């Protein structure tokens, strides 16, 4: 079998993508944000304290005839950026572009934190991360790739994120009009549950390529690049009036600049992220200060290949045995 759904961003700074999904029986649709940095497929529903929705599509697993509850399961996340959500679980059928796992573990909100609330466009998570990160208890659970793999044509899926437009999801196959050249693949550490890998260096606009190693986590729901605090210093310096504002939480630039691309190697292969890739717009409304799409992972304690990155490429999460990652220009 194979899958392929449209992802689109929610806003006009591509501050995530949302992808449609067919949950329960008939089916209830949701837009979940797919995030190959965690491992719940978590949905704000009927259960989550009313003050805390606010605009978002639910799910009512009583009108699902195949829901069932995981009974006695539980459910708590956090993310890199302070948020949070928890609840319980049910079990039902999960569509992702005409691919269906059933028995899928559908992690139901109780609680979700401020941010999630006041995002009225993302209905919940779907995690693509490895298992092990699950956050399920007493029983882990699987996340949605995992659950389909076995019934795949090939272990993988691919996310092909778009700059200001929409992009695709696909589950089982490789689309090779999809992309130019050749898909470079590299290891893949799954010792702390994540796609994570070393890029062999990175170049600042024309400049010459630095072969330094950078361990990360391609990550599709984080926006942003977030590498050493030196690669960051050297791309932020090309840029006149650039600066990091501890006020703000990261490097400003001025909105009046063109911003130099940045490369990164995977392998002996590279990928050229556009400068305007780099622009996330007036810090606030009216500002002439612009916030950087490149940002120290100093405070983190890991770099993360987040959707600037991502979206410069074709990217292949492959789910063989020896899991592995493949990049290609597009």
Known sequence: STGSATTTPIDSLDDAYITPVQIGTPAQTLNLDFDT??????????????????????????????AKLLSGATWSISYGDGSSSS?????????????????????????????????????????????????????????????????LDSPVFTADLGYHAPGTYNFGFIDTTAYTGSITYTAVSTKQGFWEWTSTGYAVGSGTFKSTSIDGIADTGTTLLYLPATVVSAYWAQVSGAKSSSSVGGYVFPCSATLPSFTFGVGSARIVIPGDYIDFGPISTGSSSCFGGIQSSAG????????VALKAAFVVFNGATTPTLGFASK
């Not at 940095?37 to 195949?66: C, H, M, N, R």
């Not at 609840?87 to 005409?98: A, I, L, N």
């Open 37 to 66: 940095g965690s491992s719940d497929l978590w949905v704000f529903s009927s259960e989550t304290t009313a003050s805390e929705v606010d605009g978002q599509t639910i799910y009512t697993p009583s009108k699902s005839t195949t």
């Open 87 to 151: 609840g319980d679980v049910y079990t039902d059928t999960v569509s992702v572009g005409g691919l269906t796992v059933t028995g899928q573990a559908v992690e139901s909100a109780k609680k979700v934190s401020s941010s999630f609330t006041e995002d009225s466009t993302i209905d919940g998570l779907l995690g693509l991360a490895f298992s092990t990160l699950n956050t399920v208890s007493p029983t882990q659970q699987k996340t949605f790739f995992d659950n389909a793999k076995a019934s």
């Open 300 to 307: 983190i304690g890991i770099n993360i290949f987040g959707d």
